[PDB]
């Protein structure tokens, strides 16, 4: 009627089942405003700590490259004090703090909001462990894919901002700050300048968000026997599960990010065609099929782990605290649990 395809609306009759629970019921708190608010709050807080840690570590490396590393506790204390008062450190903290606000609000918040939207209604089994977690896999996969490319425009803007500072005055844009660079790049180089050859970031974000949210949600319920039967410390178990979740996220995410080094940084054989033709996707496929894992796992900690994992770990803890991973559990033999009360005691 309105166009070539017609969305036919149809009515149906009443249908009900013996049990009204353990299926999909949308929680009242699962709303666009509430989910977005919680996701943004958790992401911003996690991002601020992550970027502050990254700035501190890199400033320490910068200072150590010109001065001997600490020899004892006293030397370590003065070394940290000098790093804190470094002029470069203060500027880095300010700029990266802005980067954290943008990333935590548009990328981590979007991931959490989408995850809550697609996975709030999966009820768990009363007095038991949630089975049929396979049903949640499509939801988490859908959320991960949908929110995967929400960080590339900011990350490329960050790289462009920092890469501009190192050019001569004639060739320097002169960005006032990260926010100014982000607001100017779209109108100067064009929107596609913030998305060209974004495969390494997109796949990295997908493998980070999917295996972090899903593994934590799965582990937080399946491993609950530790503090439900073993009387172990619930918070300690959750911290351990979060630690496992972030470590796996880093392991599954770093190899795809190594494509940047192989394609661009590895020296090129004179006269021979590029091993990967300058295509990151082909390099990722090569990494996927490579026999030796250690070859592309090198530099995992010195390059990527401490820049991403601390942020992911905090995000899970913050998300759990606010209640993004909280599911509804009700007795299936209760009043609302089932529609057949004649066999709940007989």
């Amino acid at each position: 009627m309105f166009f070539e395809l017609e969305d036919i609306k149809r009515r149906h009759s009443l249908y009900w089942d013996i049990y009204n629970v353990q299926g999909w019921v949308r929680r009242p708190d699962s709303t666009l405003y509430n989910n977005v608010k919680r996701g943004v709050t958790a992401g911003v807080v996690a991002s601020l700590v992550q970027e502050n840690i990254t700035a501190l570590v890199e400033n320490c490396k910068l200072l150590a490259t010109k001065y001997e590393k600490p020899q004892n506790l006293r030397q370590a204390a003065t070394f940290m004090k000098e790093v804190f008062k470094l002029e470069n450190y203060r500027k880095a903290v300010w700029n990266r703090s802005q980067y954290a606000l943008c990333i935590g609000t548009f990328d981590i918040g979007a991931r959490l909001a989408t995850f809550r939207w697609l996975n709030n209604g999966w009820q768990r089994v009363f007095a038991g462990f949630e089975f049929n977690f396979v049903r949640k896999i499509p939801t988490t996969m859908l959320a991960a894919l949908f929110t995967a490319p929400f960080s590339v425009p900011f990350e490329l803007a960050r790289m462009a901002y920092y890469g501009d500072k190192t050019f001569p005055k004639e060739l320097q844009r002169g960005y006032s700050s990260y926010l100014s660079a982000l607001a100017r790049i779209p109108f100067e180089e064009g929107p596609y300048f913030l998305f060209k050859n974004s495969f390494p970031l997109i796949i990295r974000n997908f493998f980070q968000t999917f295996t972090l949210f899903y593994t934590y949600d799965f582990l937080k319920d399946k491993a609950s026997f530790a503090w439900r039967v073993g009387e172990q410390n619930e918070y300690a178990c959750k911290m351990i599960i979060a630690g496992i979740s972030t470590y796996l996220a880093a392991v599954f995410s770093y190899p795809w990010m190594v494509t940047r080094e192989m394609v661009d940084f590895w020296p090129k054989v004179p006269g021979a065609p590029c091993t990967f033709n300058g295509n990151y996707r082909k390099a990722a496929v090569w990494i996927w099929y490579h026999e030796f894992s250690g070859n592309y796992f090198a530099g995992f900690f010195t390059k990527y782990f401490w820049k991403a994992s601390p942020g992911m770990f905090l995000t899970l803890m913050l998300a759990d605290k606010v209640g993004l991973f909280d599911q509804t559990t009700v007795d299936n033999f209760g009043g609302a649990g089932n529609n057949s009360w004649e066999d709940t005691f007989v």
Partner: protein, 206 residues
């Protein structure tokens, strides 16, 4: 000769970097081509420097060479293979020829069908449950509580339960704590479950 089939001339052919240096169309069946041999000057010098006091080998300074991809498995030639296997019924003697080229070699073919193989557990389970609606059509549907006093009072018993909770006995039982609080409210002709009941509202009667 056709330039459309030549990767060098036709730029629309997407080269596979993972198959560089391997041409399945050039295989022999039986494969009788040597593509590996002693390789030096990469990390171990080909010349002699065992007793050269003024020369010391530094293997860390390895120059980068062309990537060597793993050998690609042979790809079938439909017309050639079908003719090779083809035998004339009542015109060919039943025998095996001396030549070893008559051996029937296995060559990998289209990969599309293997996508269904990878998804077979999903496809099979979907057919078993969703397509056949096993064990019933309601198990996999999103659960909805029955409407108010539907289908009959003997089964639903919403009104009587509502009165029982609102009665003196019901309040006392809730005070004891053995009986949980009421989970639905009887509105003006409709039953509405509280948001804490953790259940969807009953489907409309139409």
């Amino acid at each position: 000769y056709d330039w459309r089939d030549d990767p060098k001339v036709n730029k629309d052919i997407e080269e596979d970097i993972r198959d560089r240096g391997w041409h399945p169309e050039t295989y022999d069946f039986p494969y009788t081509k040597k593509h590996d041999d002693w390789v030096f000057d990469v990390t171990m010098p080909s010349q002699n420097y065992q007793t050269d006091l003024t020369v010391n080998i530094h293997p860390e300074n390895k120059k980068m060479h062309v990537m060597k991809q793993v050998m690609r498995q042979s790809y079938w030639d439909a017309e050639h293979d079908m003719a090779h296997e083809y035998d004339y019924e009542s015109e060919d003697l039943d025998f095996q020829c001396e030549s070893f080229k008559s051996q029937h070699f296995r060559k990998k073919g289209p990969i599309s069908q293997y996508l269904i193989l990878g998804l077979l557990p999903i496809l099979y389970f979907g057919t078993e449950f969703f397509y056949n609606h096993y064990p019933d059509e309601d198990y996999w549907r999103v659960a909805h509580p029955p409407p108010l006093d539907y289908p009959d009072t003997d089964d639903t018993d919403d009104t009587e339960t509502f009165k029982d909770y609102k009665s003196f006995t019901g309040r006392r039982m809730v005070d004891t704590g053995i009986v949980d609080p009421l989970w639905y409210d009887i509105r003006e002709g409709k039953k509405v479950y509280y948001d804490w009941a953790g259940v969807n509202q009953p489907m409309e009667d139409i």
